[PDB]
Amino acid sequence: MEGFPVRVRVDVRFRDLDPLGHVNNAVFLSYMELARIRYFQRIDWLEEGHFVVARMEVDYLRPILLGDEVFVGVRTVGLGRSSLRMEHLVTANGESAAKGLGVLVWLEGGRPAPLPEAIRERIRALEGRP
């Protein structure tokens, strides 16, 4: 997916659907998550890289139907002190279906702490940006 360093495929499940036959709003975040976890695996993925989700902003652009070909890309768009801002793009049949902006927070001892330089450099390398 152009503009995104990591992208994954997801198969729409019957279980993902609302009664009218389109993907449920919360399930979109699980699609976005698969991409983010794969991205974290590159920069303790079971511990979500020691990051916790502090905020998620999602715009649902087009409904996702059973059988749709779905891809999800993810990239870092901001690097803070203890936070990381990530953009996730879910497409259905080549069309943008949802955009999610998430704020991830690095924890140490269960409290926010400055992202380690080791993680910052791996992110800069992955994104190819300073």
Ligand X SMILES: CC(C)(COP(=O)(O)OP(=O)(O)OC[C@@H]1O[C@H](n2cnc3c(N)ncnc32)[C@@H](O)[C@@H]1OP(=O)(O)O)[C@@H](O)C(=O)NCCC(=O)NCCS
Candidate segments 1-9, 29-37, 57-65, 119-127, binder of ligand X by CB under 6 A: 57-65
| Residues in 68-107 that interact with ligand X by CB under 6 A | 80-83, 103, 105
Radius of gyration from C-alpha coordinates of the chain: 15
CA neighbours within 13 Å on the CB side: how many for 115? Answer: 22
Which tokens belong to 83? 């936070």
What CA–CA distance (Å, rounded) separates 94 from 96? 7
In order, the DSSP letters of 69-115 are: EEEEEEEEEEE-SSEEEEEEEEEETTEEEEEEEEEEEEEETTEE-PP
Tell me if 112 contacts ligand X by CB under 6 A.
Answer: yes
Binding mask 54-93 toward a copy of itself (x if CB under 8 A, else -) reads xxxxxxx--x------------------------------
Binding mask 22-61 toward a copy of itself (x if CB under 8 A, else -) reads x-xxxxxxx--x------------xxx---xxxxxxxxx-
Out of 18, 47, 69, 95, the only residue in the binding site for Zn ion (CB under 5 A) is 18
Among Zn ion, ligand X, a copy of itself, none, partner that 46 touches (CB below 5 to 8 angstroms by kind):
a copy of itself
Three-class secondary structure of residue 42 per DSSP: coil
| Residues at the interface with ligand X (CB under 6 A) | 18, 22, 25, 52-55, 59-63, 80-83, 103, 105, 112
